[PDB]
A paper describes a structure:
[name] is an adipocyte-derived protein hormone that promotes satiety and energy homeostasis by activating the [name] ([name])–STAT3 signaling axis in a subset of hypothalamic neurons. Activation of [name] in turn drives the phosphorylation and activation of the transcription factor Signal Transducer and Activator of Transcription 3 (STAT3), which drives production of anorexigenic peptides that suppress food intake and increase energy expenditure. [name] is a member of the class 1 cytokine receptor family which includes the related receptors glycoprotein 130 (gp130) and LIF receptor (LIFR). The structure reveals an asymmetric architecture in which a single [name] induces [name] dimerization via two distinct receptor-binding sites.
Residue numbers in the entry:
A (entry chain A): 332 to 826
B (entry chain D): 22 to 167
C (entry chain C): 1 to 141
D (entry chain B): 328 to 826
The structure:
């Protein structure tokens, strides 16, 4: 004899029960009824009550979610006499009801998309879910409540396991009170009510017309973009930028000025392709961030001219008795520090007393061969990019009278190892205007293993680091350099 | 709710309605020289000064718009009823009571003129509403009377 | 087959059975102090000594399990009949030629309590047969 | 009838089985005598006369024995045998179908003892077109029988072919100790054939889950890996465990070991290194041999911890920074990090203990730095560097003392340097005949005018000639200093420059 036999309620409430024990043709007093749940725990007497001499009442408090026990979805409670229990029992059902609802506003302010998941409901079979809502023409109250006038909403369970709810057309400033309604065979319950304002959940469109450029003569990465359509244009903008490659080391910058259409950023390397994307959200921070804009790619142009003309050296081919001697100029491509971004062509300038000055565009070649006939001839190699030639360029004057001047007194070579050789020399005490010195070396009998190096005139001891083969014989030549031309070199063979 | 927030929201809705009218007008390329008779019921571009006239003319426009079979025009009418709600809210903020503009009889000329030209009536109504709504935005900047 | 293998196989079977009932009943832990009405036909309240009493009691446990619709219980009943066959063979090995009289079940109260107290039926059945299995485990030596 | 009559016309048989045909060959209007008739298989192999048998003057018989599986021949899945008058082969033939009934039956039982799974390979049945496959099984009450055989009554069971090309089908619920007699039955228009049946006991084909809660650690005082685990809940029988261990890296050179006592849930094994990280896995199977290994366990990573206090203190030297006239002299102690053998696993910090007659003894923690500079102000100062890990300082440490009075004691008599090569130089010296209780000698050398070419070496006091292996440049001038070191401090060194 139970009353009631089955009970529905949610987490966080109390409970109350009533029992009448019938044995044979006798009814015992309620002072001897012993309550039990699942026949495993003796309920404390403090939870009991005696409303009548034949009725035992037990009151619970702060009931918790039930853990499923096999096929059963309920726990059986037993009102027993002493240790004698009647085969009958009651039924209890708790169910979790706290379900969160996710809504978004489309970027075109046409439709409401709400989403939620029935995962907590999956444990109950036979329960039917319905979404019930009421729209307030005003804004959402501080405490959303289940309005008596509610409406059903049709939602589609997606492959993700979420129900999607499409509402259209919309009312941005209207409050939309929402709560889930579940309907089982035993009754119906409701999730905690929630109210959402469509304006507060707007996800804007991605920014458009993203154009990336490195400002010339400054090296500043300037970006220009078209703002997607938005009310008040009160948009907070986020810009991410990174190097173009397999991994884009994205760096970010924020533009607080909602009126700004273009911005410029400093970049370390002015000659690299970069990838930049922009996303925007409401300036107040409400709603969502927009999709990242299309990636804009920087084009590698020459922001500035090359900074220095390539260092060059001559090769003397031609007999000593011949006044006319071909001269082969040997320089090297400019480094990324010297070429900046690139060197487009090599133009070698010449200087003579009679023919004056002229230049020859060698192109991409690092070599230019020419005949020497005039007693005085000055040469200078220029590196030209799209914006023009290089600024600081090396000069080299050739002089018949000055070539006879011997400025080097002694010379000595000491091989530290196969990787280094010491060079020793002493200068003539004459007050020669030595700009610098050129160490020129090669393997003897080898006409193409040719090497050379400029060193400042103040250096007296120098170390050369190269793969030196002791078996091979090396020819070493040091050249004194002046205004007028090169002095007579000092040449030794071997160490 | 502070009065300034209400005024800012009203200006926001003014701008948005102006924007949507522009959006539909771009899709509806109509020469402005098309003089169609019988359109005196649509409020003209006249100096509108006090909030009561704001509510009255906006209700007239919404009634005109509601008769148009375009869904976007229907959502525009929804925005207009919302803007009437905010106009009445502003009226309460300034301790003035706008007359309940619920007694506007349905214009008998609507049935006779919409059948003649649904499209041209829509275009002219949108243009005149937009002009009147800029008039409102200017007036709202200068504290319009009750 | 030699009798020692029969004995050790029976021991292995019964301990598998008790391990299974333990690993299933963990979700249905019960207090044996509580006595329920209407389940008098379920034995386990007395020590078990002789061959015929074991056979009859385990036939009763068979029939009560067969009334319960659970796949795990289905396998349990299968194993119970297996061990009943084992004990029949063991009795035959004892060189006692007593006629085998089995059956004699009158289960209408079984049906009533089955349609009444399914949960109570299964829990009391598992607990009592569990205890009986341990008692016969001690009696086995 | 027909000119050639094969009775029976078509025959289906198994491998190794014996089959026989009969022909009645009629050539034109005359029936060829049975003695003039030759058989041919696929018109490519004449059957020998010894197999010929004569039933009657018109009926000749050939009895194939120990038949082999028919090899498919293009579109032909049969071997066509021809009744031929000598060489006159008629265009009709008898078809013989031979299939291999030897289909291995692979079975499995889950560690939960609730699912029985079996597989077999259809690897030979493709050579029979229109053959209907079916599984027939029969349950024995207890145990499998000694000689398996097909039961007259059996139960069909559907099985599914997977992408592996094998057939899959299971049983649930299962009988733990009931013999299962099953076989593959084929059905075709020529009859039915059965595979040689095998009986399986469900309890002998059980493999468990890998044992869980495996833990590993390094024993601090012994040096054997300590590993504990827990047996799977099922099966309950006694099991044997096999343990594998190896280093941490891209490749693992595992080493295998096993335990036999099921009651032991712990183990200890010898190791070669202590401060590395090892990986270890275990697997379990029945002791008797029934069932299968339970894959392996999840990989386990040990933790590196300081096993013991460092074994020795670091060898250290000193740099004099300060004028001879100045009584206060800076002392830059210089040592090196302990090796893997010396640091054992790690040296967490360097603690430099000092000793004086006045300030007593005190220690300075230098951290991870291998140098320490301090001022020398007392006449007597003993210093001792301690290497401290998590467990404590090193046991035996080198001691060094500084003394003003005996700093004038000159113990080294001669000092000579001889350059063997750029990679070796000989040092030779002679000692003073005084009974100096010399602890050891310190060879200190540098390049002259180089203040950071500091190098030094401690050598035993008994050595009289030493060889230094280093990159020697003959051009550079080298300063060589040999320091006599005593209990009371370091004696006056002998210094030479160059060779």
């Amino acid at each position: 004899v139970y009353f009631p036999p089955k009970i529905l309620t949610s987490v966080g409430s109390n409970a109350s029960f009533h029992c009448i024990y019938k044995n044979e043709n006798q009814i015992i007093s309620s002072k001897q009824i012993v309550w039990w749940r699942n026949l495993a725990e003796k309920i404390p007497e403090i939870q009991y009550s005696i409303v009548s001499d034949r009725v035992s009442k037990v009151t619970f408090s702060n009931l918790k979610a039930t853990r499923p026990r096999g096929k059963f979805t309920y726990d059986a409670v037993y009102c027993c006499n002493e240790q004698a229990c009647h085969h009958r029992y009651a039924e209890l059902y708790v169910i979790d009801v706290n379900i969160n609802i996710s809504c978004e506003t489309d970027g075109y302010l046409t439709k409401m998309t709400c989403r939620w998941s029935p995962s907590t409901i999956q444990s109950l079979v036979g329960s039917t879910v319905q979404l019930r809502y009421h729209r307030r023409s005003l804004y959402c109250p501080d405490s959303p409540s289940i309005h008596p006038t509610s409406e059903p909403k049709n939602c589609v369970l997606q492959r993700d396991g979420f129900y999607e709810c499409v509402f259209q057309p919309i009312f941005l400033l209207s409050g939309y009170t929402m709560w889930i309604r579940i309907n089982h065979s035993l009754g119906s319950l409701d999730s905690p009510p929630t109210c959402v304002l469509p304006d507060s959940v707007v996800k804007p469109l991605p920014p458009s017309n993203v154009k990336a450029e490195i400002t010339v003569n400054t090296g500043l990465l300037k970006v220009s973009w078209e703002k997607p359509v938005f009310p008040e244009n009160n948009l907070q903008f986020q810009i991410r930028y990174g190097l173009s490659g397999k991994e884009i080391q994205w760096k970010t910058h924020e533009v607080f000025d909602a009126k700004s259409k273009s911005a410029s950023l400093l970049v370390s390397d002015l000659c690299a392709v970069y990838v930049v994307q922009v996303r925007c959200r409401r300036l107040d921070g409400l709603g969502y961030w927009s999709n990242w804009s299309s990636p804009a790619y920087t084009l590698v142009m020459d922001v500035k001219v090359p900074m220095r003309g390539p260092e060059f050296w001559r090769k003397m081919d031609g007999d000593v008795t011949k006044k006319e001697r071909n001269v082969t100029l040997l320089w090297k491509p400019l480094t990324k520090n010297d070429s900046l971004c690139s060197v487009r062509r090599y133009v070698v300038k010449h200087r003579t007393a009679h023919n004056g000055t002229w230049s020859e565009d060698v192109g991409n070649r690092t070599n230019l061969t020419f005949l020497w006939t005039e007693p005085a001839h000055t040469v200078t190699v220029l590196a030209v990019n799209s914006l023009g030639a290089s600024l600081v360029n090396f000069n080299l004057t050739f002089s018949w009278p000055m070539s006879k001047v011997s400025a080097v007194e002694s010379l000595s070579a000491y091989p530290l190892s196969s990787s280094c050789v010491i060079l020793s020399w002493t200068l003539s005490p004459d007050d020669y205007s030595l700009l610098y010195l050129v160490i020129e070396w090669k393997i003897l009998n080898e006409d193409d293993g040719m090497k050379w190096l400029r060193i400042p005139s103040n250096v007296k001891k120098f170390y050369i680091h190269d793969n030196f083969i002791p078996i091979e014989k090396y020819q070493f030549s040091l050249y004194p350099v002046f205004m007028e031309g090169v002095g007579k070199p000092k040449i030794i063979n071997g160490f | 709710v502070p009065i300034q927030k209400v005024q800012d929201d009203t200006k926001t809705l003014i701008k948005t309605i102006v924007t949507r009218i522009n959006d539909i007008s771009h899709t509806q390329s109509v020469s402005a020289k098309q003089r169609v008779t019988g359109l005196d019921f649509i409020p003209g571009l006249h100096p509108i000064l006090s909030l009561s006239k704001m509510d009255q003319t906006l209700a007239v426009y919404q009634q005109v718009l509601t008769s148009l079979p375009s869904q976007n025009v229907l959502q525009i009418a929804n925005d207009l009823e919302n803007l009437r709600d905010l106009l009445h809210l502003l009226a309460f903020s300034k301790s003035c009571s706008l007359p309940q503009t619920s007694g506007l009889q349905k214009p008998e000329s609507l049935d006779g003129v919409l059948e003649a030209s649904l499209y041209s009536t829509e275009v002219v109504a949108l243009s005149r509403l937009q002009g009147s709504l800029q008039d409102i935005l200017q007036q709202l900047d200068v504290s319009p009377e009750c």
